[PDB]
Each structure stands twice: as C-alpha cells, then as structure tokens.
Design an enzyme around this catalytic site. Structure first.
Site, PDB file in Angstrom:
ATOM      1  N   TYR A   1     -25.907 -17.022  -5.852  1.00  0.00           N
ATOM      2  CA  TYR A   1     -26.322 -16.853  -4.450  1.00  0.00           C
ATOM      3  C   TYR A   1     -26.560 -15.378  -4.205  1.00  0.00           C
ATOM      4  CZ  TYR A   1     -24.267 -21.330  -3.779  1.00  0.00           C
ATOM      5  OH  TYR A   1     -23.937 -22.644  -3.909  1.00  0.00           O
TER       6      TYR A   1
ATOM      7  N   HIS B   1     -29.290 -20.452   2.110  1.00  0.00           N
ATOM      8  CA  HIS B   1     -30.094 -20.054   1.006  1.00  0.00           C
ATOM      9  C   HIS B   1     -29.101 -19.760  -0.108  1.00  0.00           C
ATOM     10  CE1 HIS B   1     -31.951 -16.205  -0.766  1.00  0.00           C
ATOM     11  NE2 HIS B   1     -32.467 -17.216  -1.436  1.00  0.00           N
TER      12      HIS B   1
ATOM     13  N   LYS C   1     -38.741 -27.126  -8.325  1.00  0.00           N
ATOM     14  CA  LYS C   1     -37.951 -27.544  -9.468  1.00  0.00           C
ATOM     15  C   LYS C   1     -37.579 -26.339 -10.324  1.00  0.00           C
ATOM     16  CE  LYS C   1     -39.620 -32.255  -9.736  1.00  0.00           C
ATOM     17  NZ  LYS C   1     -40.460 -33.171 -10.469  1.00  0.00           N
TER      18      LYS C   1
END
Lengths: 183, 93, 183, 96
Positions: A120, A128, A159
């Site tokens: 992250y 997000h 993807k």
C-alpha cells in the site's frame, strides 16, 4: 519500546508504544480491530500484534526490543534464525519485505488475497487499494497459468499484479509487473 | 508446424498487426502503431526466470514493450504486458 | 478418425468426425468458437483442436489416429514422450486427466482460471459451473496461502475448489475438496 | 503461535464454540452445532501433504468434519472445510 515474542508473532502491550508504531508505518494490527485509521488510534487501548517480518524489521531499525518468554532480549539474528527454522524461504521473503519497506511502502499480510504480500502507498483502509505481490520461490519456473492466476488475484480491472523474487546469483530483489493487454 | 503458436499470429493479424520478425521459437516482433516484442507461452510449458528476464531485457534494449501471449492447451489466446519494475520511493512515505 | 499433430496440439479437419468427438464427451474446441452447445454442433463447420492430454487419451482409447508432419502414425507412446519432454509433470498431470475422464467428467483447460483443469459434468455450455482443480506438484507442501488462493480462484460463492495430486509412495490420485467455512 | 494459536481460540469462543479437547500441537476438537476437528495453519508455515492427509483421516476416524483454521501473520482467522473426495462416476457422461 518493548514487544513480546510469543510463538511466531510479537505482541506489544505498552499501548502508548503500540499507538506510535501504528501511526508511524502502520505496523501491526490491534486486537481485535481492523482497518483502524490513524485518527482513531488514540482511542484504542488494545494490544498490537506484529508479524515476524515486521518485528524483525523494526528490531533491525531499532524501533523495537523483543523480549522472549524467559525474559531474554531476542536480537535480530535470533529472530531470523527462528523464521528460517519455521518458515520456508524466510530469508528471501524478508528481503522482499525489507525492499518495499525501505522504499516507504506499507507491507501487509497477503493471505487474504492468496498472495505473499499486499503493498500500500497510504494504508490499507483507507483508501487505495492493494498491490498484490506474488512470490516466485527458488528453483521454480513460470508458466502461462501463473500469469492468469495472478490476474485473478488482482483487485484491478486491469488485472495488474507483481511478481517478487530474489535472484540466487546476485541476491538482487527483482519485481515484475503484469497486467492484462487488450490488443 | 505449430498450431498453438499459429493461433497467436492469426489473432494478431486479424486486428491489424504486421509480423515484423521472428527472433526465435516463441519470440517475435509485431507492429500496430508501435512495435512490440511478443513471447508465446503455451499452457503447461514452463520457462525459467532467467529466460523471462532475458526477454524482458531484450525489450528494454530494443525499446519495445513486452507482451506475453498466453495460449491455452487448445488454442485460446490471452495477452499480458510485462515489465521489470524500478520501484521509486513512495511519495506518501 | 484422423487428426494431425502440429506442435503440442492435434487438429481434426474431418468435421463429421470432429462433431462426433465433441458430441461424445465434449473433446476439443472448434476454432473460432467457445462453449458450443451439443445441439449447436451440427451447424458448425470449423476444425477442432484437441489438447495433447485429450489427444493422448483418445488415442489410447482407440478413438483417434494421430498423424505426424511426415505423414506417419504417432502412437500413444510417442505422444506421451513428446509431452513428457516439453511439459513439466506430464505424467502426473495426465494421470489426473485420466482419473477424471475415466469417471466420465469433461476435463478442460484450467488456464483461464489460473488452475490446472476445469472440470464439468455436463460441460460447456452449459450449464455450467466448472470445478476448479489445482495441482500439487511433487515434493511440495501446502500452506494457508495456497488455500485462500484456491478460494479466490473459485467461481463459487462458497469458494469451493479441488486440489489434485499423485501420492509419491502409492501412485494413488488423491482429490481434496476445500470450501470456505462460515462458522 | 502461542499468540497466533490463541487468536483462533478467542475467535471460536466469540462465535459460540466450546473447546472440547486439545489433541496436539495445532489440532483440537470444538463444538457448536456439531463437533469439528480443527487444524491450525499459520501464514508462511508449510505442512506436508502427508500431514494434511493424516488430519483428514483422523476426522474420518473420529467421525467429525475437518476445519482448517488459517491464521495471518498478524492474527486474522479464516476457516475452510476440507475433505477427501470420493468422486462418483458422472451420470451425465455422454455415450461413446
């Protein structure tokens, strides 16, 4: 600055320290909370649990002193030996952990995603929205099916997913990024 | 010769790619607005990390994005981009 | 009952034969089509491609005669030798293919799923719901992350998936079924 | 793994299970509607296929379903059923 080794994780019982770790790297998880935000941290009084990679990193930096069940200090090299004994590929995986952390990224468990790590920029929630990191172990090749599998693990419509490995020859951490191509 | 790889050529050709060069088994350059380096990966056929990294490096050298063309055991083709990441420091560190 | 070996797959140019193979257990795929229904078959006019495992199986069953590029017959033994040399774990994976096929199940590529096979009772298409089958290769263990991964590959809300392996010592094909427990 | 294993006990208790018997490192019986055999798996800790097969076989021997309790590196618990499949012949198989 204390945490206690209890098996394969370390628990921080000093809540004021626990809070500092979480607001300064999103290290650990408070029992039994999740998706804790920085601004609700002060009103949390629960122990913090750190995973072995987290604890080792913090010990190296030295932002944590780890205490064992017999009251011994557990040094970094001791933590690593434990990981190596119990967790296949610990050394390579730690290298990856440290790679991302040294560059300023928040690294969390990938279990929920079926992956090695979730990585992250800001923090899990919010917002997000993890990069899914898949491990390539030693001696293992790659095939088409690995690639679609990563695409499935992705939470992006593109993807997108990352493969992390450590090259045996050099020790280089190598990250590859993949994404679906609508050609 | 190889019907699975052929499915890739047919697919790309159907949408306006030109095949520019075949570099190896499994490796070719094709173009539609920009040249790409393609690497065909057939289901069940494993390659080493070194091989993949080399293809990726070829892309960088030739200044071309790399595309993996994945082919199912019976000819369905799916494409993924791949690149070697150079991970910058997190801005929000 | 002829098909043509061209690389790692076999092409059937005899359409009437192709239709029979497809009707008689959903072997192969028609070029340009997917999930063709059993009735829709009579109005398809395209070659059929058979994956290597499929072709080997049919060849062993005497339902297909395979011809190489030189125009000579390719015996089942030669097909297996080709697979073994190009595809890691061919023998083990074929054993698994056969296990399901011998029991009457339709066994299809797993690539789109990120898995070894997709397994149907009535096939595509459809109706429908394939079982996702994940391979456990030789000399490899299982971890929590493997299990959550399989759960993610599943298209069931119950996150159901199957692990298939061949037991080192006995040669037994073993299937394990996993699913998410909401306790 | 004191603490990680303890997370599983705490979680099951929260879900209204009672712990019946500890059989082993990482193996225990607990009960809500029925009794289950639990096996705890920690993120990153690999277990041989033989080991897993043994546990599944114990559940068969004890007549209880088997639940894998999966624990993340920092203490989140997720459960999966596991069983050995005995695959029946497919009634829908097309004639050959």
């Amino acid at each position: 600055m204390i945490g206690y080794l209890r098996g394969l994780a370390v628990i921080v019982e000093d809540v004021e320290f626990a809070r500092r770790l979480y607001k300064e790297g999103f290290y650990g998880r408070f029992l039994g909370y999740d998706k804790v935000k920085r601004d609700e941290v002060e009103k949390i009084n629960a122990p913090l649990i750190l995973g072995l990679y987290e604890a080792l990193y913090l010990a190296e930096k030295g932002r944590l002193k780890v205490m064992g069940e017999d009251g011994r200090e557990v040094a970094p090299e001791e933590l690593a030996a434990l990981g190596r004994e119990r967790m296949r590929n610990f050394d390579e995986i730690y290298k990856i952990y440290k790679y991302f952390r040294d560059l300023g990224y928040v690294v969390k468990s990938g279990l929920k995603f079926g992956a090695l790590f979730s990585v992250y920029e800001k923090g899990p929630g919010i917002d997000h929205a993890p990069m899914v990191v898949v491990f390539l172990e030693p001696d293992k090749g790659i095939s088409a099916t690995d690639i679609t599998r990563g695409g499935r693990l992705s939470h992006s419509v593109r993807k997108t997913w990352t493969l992390a490995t450590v090259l045996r020859q050099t020790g280089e951490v190598v990250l590859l990024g993949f994404g679906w191509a609508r050609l | 010769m190889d019907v699975l790889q052929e499915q890739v050529f047919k697919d790309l050709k159907s949408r306006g790619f030109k095949i520019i060069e075949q570099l190896d088994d499994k490796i070719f350059i094709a173009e539609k607005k920009e040249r790409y380096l393609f690497y065909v990966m057939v289901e069940g056929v494993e390659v080493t990390i070194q091989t993949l990294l080399s293809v990726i490096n070829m892309g960088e050298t030739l200044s071309m994005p790399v595309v993996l063309a994945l082919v199912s055991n019976d000819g369905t083709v799916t494409y993924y981009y791949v690149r070697k990441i150079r991970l910058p420091r997190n801005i929000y560190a």
